[PDB]
From Swiss-Prot:
Entry GO CC: endoplasmic reticulum membrane
Spans through the membrane: 29-49, 54-74, 174-193, 198-219
Keywords: Disease variant, Endoplasmic reticulum, Fatty acid biosynthesis, Fatty acid metabolism, Iron, Lipid biosynthesis, Lipid metabolism, Membrane, Metal-binding, Microsome, Oxidoreductase, Transmembrane, Transmembrane helix
GO molecular function terms noted in the UniProt entry: iron ion binding; metal ion binding; palmitoyl-CoA 9-desaturase activity; stearoyl-CoA 9-desaturase activity
Cytoplasmic side of membrane: 75-173, 220-315
Recorded domain comment: The histidine box domains are involved in binding the catalytic metal ions.
Expressing tissues: Detected in liver (at protein level). Detected in skin and liver. Detected in sebaceous gland, but not in hair follicle. Detected in white and brown adipose tissue, eyelid, Harderian gland, and at lower levels in Meibomian gland, eyeball and adrenal gland. Highly expressed in liver, and detected at low levels in brain, heart, lung, stomach, skeletal muscle and kidney.
Species in which this protein is naturally found: Mus musculus
EC assignment: 1.14.19.1
Cofactor detail note: Expected to bind 2 Fe(2+) ions per subunit, instead of the Zn(2+) ions seen in the 3D-structure.
Intervals of motif Histidine box-2: 113-117
Name under which the protein is recorded: Acyl-CoA desaturase 1
Matches recorded under PANTHER family: ACYL-COA DESATURASE, STEAROYL-COA DESATURASE
Amino acid sequence: DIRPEMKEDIHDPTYQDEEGPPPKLEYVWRNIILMVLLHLGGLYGIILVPSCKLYTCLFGIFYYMTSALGITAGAHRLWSHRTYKARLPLRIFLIIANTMAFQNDVYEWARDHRAHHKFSETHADPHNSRRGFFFSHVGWLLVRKHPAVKEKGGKLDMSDLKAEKLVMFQRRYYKPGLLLMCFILPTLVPWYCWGETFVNSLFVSTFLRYTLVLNATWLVNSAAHLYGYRPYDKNIQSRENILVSLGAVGEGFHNYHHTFPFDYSASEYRWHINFTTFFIDCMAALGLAYDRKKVSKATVLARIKRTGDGSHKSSENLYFQ
Ligand SMILES: CCCCCCCC/C=C\CCCCCCCC(=O)SCCNC(=O)CCNC(=O)[C@H](O)C(C)(C)COP(=O)(O)OP(=O)(O)OC[C@H]1O[C@@H](n2cnc3c(N)ncnc32)[C@H](O)[C@@H]1OP(=O)(O)O
Ligand SMILES: [Fe+3]
Ligand SMILES: [Fe+3]
């Protein structure tokens, strides 16, 4: 019990789907067209990529990287799971980086996630993997949420995020933030700083980039809940897919993370394909993050022995941490 600070992300196994047949999905047509156009505009930006100035590509990667941290170190580990404490400067960089990533504000992000952990693979899970790959990748954003999500998730404590002034600052002014950070500024910066043509900055440095931060994130719900190993808990659906960790800068050890949702590393190994933990460990070094809550090797090993599927004994002691 390394974090009794909060407890609204611990898996509740007593909950199961027991409300009769699931109501039919309700399509939301505003989202469908935008998500279509986006992945078109992202796809069109791909054929444009060879005709881009070098700085435009690097800027895109940096922007992909910064938005990544705004979700992995920011929304996921700091605010949804409370796995460490951050000082004002880092939290300001994170709250901006989050706004470039455009995955709703932080209060609405963590609520959907805190429900995803507690009520995983149920109708109260906002991206119920058991509905299918498409649903949990992008489809959950195109149809209405099961009443279980609203009902059960509404009973989760969000007092901590309610009582943080910076998370609520984002919430109040989120609409102008995302327009500036996700679409306007990463288009005008390449357009001015090194003269990338507007058609390229819009479709490479914005639509493709956002489409790649978007899809890289959705792979943690779709792929990580189907393909991979289960060294730590064979009884859940979260997996250790290494590719996911690569694109999602560390959040690919979903089987560990769903078992140990309080570990600040989201993984057994601190720096292994986990650029996010590395970043978090640098802020630690600079005195802007402390109380990095990692799980003891005895608790992990005993948990592998209990509910593990036994694939771990091909990674047993390959890094110190
Ligand atoms: C490279 C980085 C890698 C990162 C790796 C991360 C791994 C982390 C671990 C695992 C993965 C986590 C990643 C998932 C996050 C991805 C998020 C995005 O990508 S968003 C893209 C842009 N934004 C949209 O596209 C919005 C589209 N969504 C919508 O339009 C609606 O939300 C929609 C259609 C999905 C649902 O429609 P409805 O009307 O049925 O539900 P509604 O409108 O959202 O909520 C209304 C009321 O329902 C309650 N309610 C909803 N959700 C609740 C909850 N979770 N708990 C309690 N009550 C809830 C609340 O009362 C809420 O009202 P009140 O928000 O307070 O004003
Ligand atoms: Fe998950
Ligand atoms: Fe999580």
